[PDB]
């Protein structure tokens, strides 16, 4: 947006590095180590996931690794998920 020389090609490179971030986070998490990587800090004193939301990497953050970890962070090891929470709201 800030330049007008060729805006059709900066977007292609941004999508290339977004998809490269998806594949590197997919290989780097391995089985279940996404909590370390997403809970890691940055060069500045902020977490990685807060970067990644201010980074606006929607293609990265919709990948299944950060999504299922983020559902694990949504539960917080509560783990009586589907039914007793729906009762427990009434409670």
Ligand X SMILES: CCCCCCCCCCCCCCCC(=O)OC[C@H](COP(=O)([O-])OCC[N+](C)(C)C)OC(=O)CCCCCCCCCCCCCCC
Closest residue to ligand X: CB criterion = 85
**CA gyration radius, the chain:** 17
Binder of residue 82, out of a second copy, ligand X, none (CB less than 5 to 8 A by kind): ligand X
53 makes contact with a second copy (CB under 8 A): yes
Residue 36 DSSP label: H
The residues in 62-81 that bind ligand X, with binding defined as CB under 6 A, are 81
> What b/e readout covers 33-67, taking b as 16+ CB neighbours within 10 angstroms?
ebeebbeeeeeeeeeebebbeeeebeebbebebbe
Which chain residues interact with a second copy by CB under 8 A? 4-7, 26, 31, 47, 49-50, 53, 56, 58-59, 61-62, 64-68, 70, 73-74, 76
């Amino acid at each position: 947006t800030k330049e007008k020389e060729r805006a059709k090609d900066l977007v292609a490179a941004g999508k290339q590095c977004e998809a490269m971030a998806t594949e590197l986070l997919a290989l780097a998490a391995g089985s279940d180590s996404a909590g370390k990587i997403l809970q890691a800090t940055d060069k500045r004193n902020v977490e990685f996931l807060d970067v990644l939301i201010e980074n606006e990497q929607k293609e990265v953050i919709a990948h299944t690794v950060v999504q299922r970890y983020l559902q694990e962070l949504w539960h917080g090891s509560l783990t009586w998920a589907s039914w007793k929470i729906l009762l427990l709201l009434v409670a």
